[PDB]
Each structure stands twice: as C-alpha cells, then as structure tokens.
C-alpha cells in the first residue's frame with residue numbers, strides 16, 4: 167500500500183513539534199510513518215532549557231545505508247521534510263529524494279510526492295540550501311516568514327503572497343501553500359494561498375481565510391503539513407487544504423477552551439467540523 | 449496523570465520499540481514522553497542494521513532538560529524497553545527514584561515503573577552479555593516486569609519450557625524484588641496450537657497469586673509483539689486490575705497478529721511483510737475483539 171511516508175523532522179521527548187506533531191495524525195489516517203529524527207531534544211525551543219542530540223551528515227548517511235541495503239527506499243510514496251537546520255543534510259535530502267524516485271520508477275510504482283516544509287523561522291547557508299532543495303519539491307508549505315526570506319518578497323497580502331509563490335514555481339516547486347499571513351485591511355482573519363503551476367506554464371490560484379485567534383501556537387505548521395499529506399492522498403489539493411485548515415482550527419479552538427493536545431480529539435484529526443472554503447482566483 | 453516516560457528504541461522502518469508503543473498509548477489517551485535509546489534503520493532481524501546508539505552522557509543530557517523544565521513530576525508511569533547499554537540500564541533506578549521524589553513534592557500518587565528487560569528473542573541476545581546483570585539490579589526497583597521466556601530464562605538461570613519452570617523463573621523475579629511479573633509466552637508440549645503465559649503477583653504476606661491463560665499460536669516469527677503488549681499493559685492497568693489488563697493486552701496482540709497475517713504477513717513471508725500492522729485497526733488497539741482468560745492457579 168502506497169500510504170507510506172518518510173518523515174525527516176525533529177523529535178522532542180516533551181511536547182508536540184516535528185515528528186511528535188506529524189506522526190499521530192498520519193498514523194490515525196492509516197499511513198506508515200518512517201521517521202528519521204534530525205534532532206532528539208528534551209522539548210521545543212519555547213521552554214527555558216533545551217538539551218539533546220543533533221544528527222550530523224554521517225548519522226543521516228548511516229541510517230540511509232540501512233534503508234538502502236534492506237531495499238526499503240521503494241516503499242516511500244511520500245517524503246515529508248521539516249526541521250533539519252543543517253546545510254549538509256538539507257543538500258543530502260535532495261540525493262535521498264532522487265534515490266527514492268529512481269527506486270520507485272524501476273519498480274514501476276507511482277512517483278513519490280516530496281512535501282518540503284522549509285523550516286527556518288517565524289515572526290543563510292540553510293536558506294540557500296532550501297532554495298536548491300525546492301528545485302526538486304512537489305509541494306512546499308512555507309509559513310509567511312519562510313516564503314518571504316526564500317523569494318525575497320515581503321508576504322503581507324494576497325498580491326505579495328502570489329509573487330512569493332511565483333518564485334517557488336520558477337525555482338521548480340509546482341504546488342505551494344503559504345499557510346497563513348495577517349492582513350492590515352482584515353484584522354480578524356488569516357489568509358492562505360494555494361498556487362498550482364502546470365507543463366502548460368499556467369497557474370491555478372486558490373485562497374480563503376481562517377479566524378485569527380489571539381495567541382501563539384507551537385507545532386501548527388507541523389500538524390498542518392502532516393494533515394495536508396493525509397487529505398491530499400485521496401482529495402484534490404484545494405479540498406485537502408480546506409480539511410487541513412479545518413483540523414488546525416479544531417485544535418486551536420480546543421486549546422482556547424500554547425501546546426496543541428494533538429492526541430486529545432482523534433475524531434477531529436480525521437473529520438474536522440471547521441473546513442475552510444478554498445476558492446479559485448480569477 | 450495519563451503521562452508516560454517511555455525509554456525504548458526508535459526505528460525508521462517497521463514496528464518495534466517506541467514507535468510500536470507510542471501509537472497504542474496515544475489512542476488510550478496517554479501523553480508519551482519518548483527517550484529514544486537508539487535511532488536505527490530497522491529492527492535486528494534484518495540482515496543490516498544501521499544508526500546511532502545513546503551513551504550514558506546522551507541519556508543524562510536529556511534527563512537534565514526534563515529536570516530543568518520541571519517535567520519529572522508529570523510521569524505517573526515509566527516504561528523501559530530496548531536500552532542494551534549497561535550504563536543507561538543502571539541509570540534507570542536513579543531516574544525512577546528522582547521521579548518518585550518529584551511526585552511526592554507535588555502531592556501526586558507514586559509512579560508505577562514497568563520494566564521490559566529487552567535483551568533478545570529466539571535464544572539470541574541482541575547486544576553485550578553484561579546487560580543481563582544490569583537488568584537483575586534494575587528489576588529489584590521495578591513494580592512490573594514483562595520478560596519473554598528467553599529473558600526470564602537468562603535472568604533467573606531457569607530454562608522456561610513449561611508452566612512449572614515459568615513459575616520457578618517468576619519466583620526468582622519476586623526474590624529479586626519485582627512484585628508483579630508477566631512471562632508473556634512459552635510452549636505447551638501437549639498443545640502446539642496455543643501459547644501459555646503466566647502472571648505472578650507477590651504481596652506483604654510473602655504470598656504469591658499466580659494466573660495462567662493461553663492464546664492461539666500463529667506459525668511465524670513476529671517482532672514488536674512484546675513492545676505493543678507492554679504498552680497495552682500500561683494503558684489497561686491504569687483502569688483495570690492487572691489480571692484483566694493482561695487479558696486485554698493478550699487480546700490486542702491476537703487482533704494485531706491476525707491483521708498482520710490477513711495483509712500477507714504469514715510465517716513464510718518477508719520480514720517486511722511480518723512487521724506488525726500497528727496502524728491497520730486503531731479501534732482493535734483500544735477495544736480488542738477478544739480478551740484472554742487469566743485464571744487463578746492453586
């Protein structure tokens with residue numbers, strides 16, 4: 167079964183970021199999540215003290231040698247990358263995706279879908295390493311900050327979100343979600359953009375909004391991208407984005423009743439009540 | 449108080465250790481704080497096994513982060529599995545004692561420490577022989593232990609081959625200072641279609657309550673079965689008496705192994721095919737289609 171994801175993200179012992187945010191949602195949707203933990207930390211960088219291990223290039227290549235030797239690389243219908251924060255591993259991830267595409271092609275499986283979440287910040291070696299890696303991505307899910315530093319466009323509205331996304335397409339990513347940005351002219355909403363470049367050279371663009379909740383939520387992007395992989399498996403990307411927005415709105419609203427209790431409403435991870443309208447742009 | 453500190457292996461491919469334990473505990477509504485003792489490509493059954501192993505310094509470094517952030521009083525359960533590093537196995541007793549003091553300081557009930565002495569299977573030790581003695585020393589401080597028949601045999605020095613020898617091995621654990629022991633499976637000479645298990649509970653009077661039951665035997669070597677079993681045991685023992693928790697965990701394992709077979713993971717299939725289908729039936733991890741009888745012995 168091609169519900170098999172290689173997830174190259176952070177591990178934390180306490181709290182829900184990276185593979186701790188992504189794994190439970192995807193497993194609940196029936197995906198096998200094969201995680202490579204780029205770091206193994208006590209907690210996310212919110213808490214006063216962070217301790218633990220950071221993968222180097224040699225550790226990443228050693229793990230790859232085990233996967234390659236046991237003939238697993240053809241298993242990965244999906245590659246999902248998040249937190250890496252290491253120029254040499256970001257570069258090596260491109261080789262890993264190319265090796266997975268090759269192995270799947272030779273076994274006549276459907277081409278892998280590489281979802282690249284370019285995790286860098288919010289609110290240069292690594293920025294440039296993501297500009298190269300994104301030349302081989304199928305889907306990118308930048309926050310507004312990552313989209314701004316990668317494209318060099320300040321994402322502050324729909325016009326500037328479109329310019330940023332056009333940069334991604336020219337770089338070679340066909341499908342972009344800028345997950346949220348604030349609007350001076352609409353203070354109670356966050357807007358998202360789904361941009362799809364065809365092949366024809368043409369772009370289909372889709373937009374919509376979610377309520378802007380007061381406060382700062384950790385792991386939101388991480389749950390979002392994992393949810394997007396789950397829904398986009400069987401739903402067109404526009405409806406996949408709507409469902410994924412619906413899941414985050416359920417989780418944020420539940421917290422309101424900073425850490426997302428990702429494991430607390432399994433029902434809502436699979437079938438949210440919030441589903442965001444995702445409407446084609448003319 | 450549905451928070452677990454789980455000290456186990458991480459594998460990228462397949463279902464053993466923390467990956468196998470975390471999904472069921474999450475479905476049962478537990479927060480699983482996982483310390484990954486190793487980060488490997490796959491379990492040891494495969495021809496090639498690659499990745500990183502913690503040393504004592506890496507383990508104490510994580511513990512410092514959990515301490516500094518005041519997380520230790522959160523842990524109502526500690527569950528240890530694959531460690532296979534004498535120094536880290538030795539350090540578990542101090543970790544548990546530190547969690548116990550932190551809980552008392554916050555007016556919380558005592559933690560329950562579940563020690564799965566993960567050392568090997570099928571007559572084969574995974575790593576160095578010095579790990580055996582380290583587990584004898586840690587088990588004195590365990591509330592609950594869940595050896596396979598191989599682990600029960602090398603720890604106690606008794607070949608666990610039947611009910612009589614399982615009971616002798618279990619008595620060794622009680623003498624060592626482990627009050628509650630599950631020897632998860634062993635052979636019945638007179639019944640090759642079932643596996644027998646033992647639950648032994650030492651009080652206090654110094655009296656022992658013993659229970660036994662059987663599960664259907666499936667022809668084939670499955671791995672990760674003990675890991676799902678101990679995760680299920682923690683989950684059900686939170687709100688059931690230990691004997692019923694054992695029967696529910698045995699029922700979880702029966703559904704999970706039948707699902708593995710149904711999806712092609714027969715005796716003769718590849719190691720990859722025989723990997724447990726942990727994500728196939730989430731409902732059956734919480735609510736197994738059967739519950740094994742756990743019946744008192746004389």
Ligand SMILES: Nc1ncnc2c1ncn2[C@@H]1O[C@H](COP(=O)(O)OP(=O)(O)O)[C@@H](O)[C@H]1O
Pocket residue numbers: 288308309310345346356358376377378379380381382383384385386387388390410411414415418
């Ligand atoms: N304050 C907020 N109010 C409402 N939804 C939010 C808020 N912050 C995040 N989200 C939701 O979470 C998703 C991902 O969060 P975002 O901040 O875009 O990414 P990241 O967490 O990677 O910085 C958004 O698409 C949106 O659905």
Ligand SMILES: Nc1ncnc2c1ncn2[C@@H]1O[C@H](COP(=O)(O)OP(=O)(O)O)[C@@H](O)[C@H]1O
Pocket residue numbers: 568569595596597632633643645663664665666667668669670671672673674675677698701702705
């Ligand atoms: N081949 C099998 N047939 C039936 N049940 C099995 C089989 N292998 C494992 N089990 C189930 O899995 C549980 C734990 O597996 P066991 O082999 O005893 O532990 P471990 O995985 O630690 O070696 C058993 O108690 C039993 O319920």
Ligand SMILES: [Ca+2]
Pocket residue numbers: 288309386
């Ligand atoms: Ca954000």
Ligand SMILES: [Ca+2]
Pocket residue numbers: 285309387388
């Ligand atoms: Ca993010």
Ligand SMILES: [Ca+2]
Pocket residue numbers: 569570596670673
């Ligand atoms: Ca076994």
Ligand SMILES: [Ca+2]
Pocket residue numbers: 587588589590624625626627
């Ligand atoms: Ca004791």
Ligand SMILES: [Ca+2]
Pocket residue numbers: 566596674675
């Ligand atoms: Ca075991």
Ligand SMILES: [Ca+2]
Pocket residue numbers: 687688
């Ligand atoms: Ca009960």
Ligand SMILES: [Cl-]
Pocket residue numbers: 323324325349357
């Ligand atoms: Cl706008």
